[PDB]
Design a protein around this ligand. Sequence first.
Ligand SMILES: Nc1nc2c(ncn2[C@@H]2O[C@H](COP(=O)(O)OP(=O)(O)CP(=O)(O)O)[C@@H](O)[C@H]2O)c(=O)[nH]1
Ligand SMILES: Nc1nc2c(ncn2[C@@H]2O[C@H](COP(=O)(O)OP(=O)(O)CP(=O)(O)O)[C@@H](O)[C@H]2O)c(=O)[nH]1
Ligand SMILES: [Mg+2]
Ligand code: NA
Ligand code: NA
Ligand code: NA
Ligand code: NA
Ligand code: NA
Ligand code: NA
Ligand code: NA
Ligand code: NA
Ligand code: NA
Length: 403
Amino acid sequence: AWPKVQPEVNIGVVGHVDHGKTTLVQAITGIWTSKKLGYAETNIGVCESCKKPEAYVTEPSCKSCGSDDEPKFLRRISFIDAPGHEVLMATMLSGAALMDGAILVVAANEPFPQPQTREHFVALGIIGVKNLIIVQNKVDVVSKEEALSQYRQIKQFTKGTWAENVPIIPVSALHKINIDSLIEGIEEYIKTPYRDLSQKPVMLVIRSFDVNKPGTQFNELKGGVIGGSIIQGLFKVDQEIKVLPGLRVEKQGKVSYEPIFTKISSIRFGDEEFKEAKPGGLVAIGTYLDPSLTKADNLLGSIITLADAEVPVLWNIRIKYNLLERVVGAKEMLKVDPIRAKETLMLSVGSSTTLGIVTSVKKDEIEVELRRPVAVWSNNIRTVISRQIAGRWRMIGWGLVEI
Ligand SMILES: Nc1nc2c(ncn2[C@@H]2O[C@H](COP(=O)(O)OP(=O)(O)CP(=O)(O)O)[C@@H](O)[C@H]2O)c(=O)[nH]1
Ligand SMILES: Nc1nc2c(ncn2[C@@H]2O[C@H](COP(=O)(O)OP(=O)(O)CP(=O)(O)O)[C@@H](O)[C@H]2O)c(=O)[nH]1
Ligand SMILES: [Mg+2]
Ligand code: NA
Ligand code: NA
Ligand code: NA
Ligand code: NA
Ligand code: NA
Ligand code: NA
Ligand code: NA
Ligand code: NA
Ligand code: NA
């Protein structure tokens, strides 16, 4: 039989709106995600006596290649399925903090390169998600020749960049054509990365829930649940933890943040319970928190650490930055203006998104006064910088948060 384990690697799925990311995740895992930032898992295996790529399977059967033998289990994987709409760029960025590698979906029946094909690509590059596969989707509605013309364009686009040798795999997500080749590619190009389990446990929070059905009395009201991904170390049932920056507190119209202390009462990945949670996959951490504290993704953008961890929670930050030449996600070409004092920027840090006012500009460094504080769990954390342009938040640069 195949073991029941947590996913060991997160594969982002990104690309322009409606290019078919969610359908692709469904073709691979059998699961349709409904959430804004979607999540789905599957086991991956290989029928060792069969020919590749058909030998790759997502279920323990080799019947499709004529064997009654069980396929060799390789690993469980999971997908972080980002939204494509330009208005949802921040969500993509938050999801990108959880990715170990990625698939960039390009619709074969739309002119390449579309605005969020570019914006998501560049974001992946900046964030360091470079174990990339480019998937040419919807090849079912175009001829081989049209798809090949676009392939040439994609090679031209990636040439001279970090992605110059990234593979391009043509599929139909909708009608499930050539999916096996994509599985083979995932195994070849998106290896599970090394995890130093000795590092202090840190989890980035992207969801939080009240899991109680209506008509539940207090006597059995379950404690709040917090969802996200472990980016380093590992957590275990009964650990004393804290959520940072924590809870927004109002004292006569004055607003501050207080760390939320709690205890891990349960750990789930998908439909399975575990005693510990490691990087890879999206974990649900059960706590003893009042469910009102976690309801409706209240804690999105928080981090979780062990209760005694030392973590700066900052209302002001210094960033060693670099700007892009052009606003890549804009429809009409546009140069990136230099950062100016007093302007409001949007900062993506881990899973968090925060507005701040620029209080100092230098050539390599800016200082920013944050509208709400950010937990900075390490010394070399990358931030992605967006500017509001014609009413839309567009990525214009990035930086390292300086401690
Ligand atoms: N012909 C064809 N249509 C496809 C294929 N994959 C997806 N589609 C269609 O494209 C549309 C968008 O699919 P969807 O999976 O929601 O794309 P998405 O990128 O996740 C949408 P969003 O960017 O908002 O997350 C759907 O109508 C879907 O049926 C394909 O391989 N071939
Ligand atoms: N660790 C742990 N996780 C739980 C527990 N109960 C539910 N979860 C997790 O919390 C999440 C929310 O589950 P639930 O609210 O029951 O289903 P849902 O309504 O589809 C979630 P949403 O409200 O976002 O649509 C799920 O990922 C589930 O695995 C629990 O007792 N312990
Ligand atoms: Mg989608
Ligand atoms: Na599966
Ligand atoms: Na197969
Ligand atoms: Na990563
Ligand atoms: Na190029
Ligand atoms: Na170029
Ligand atoms: Na360029
Ligand atoms: Na990481
Ligand atoms: Na602190
Ligand atoms: Na301050």
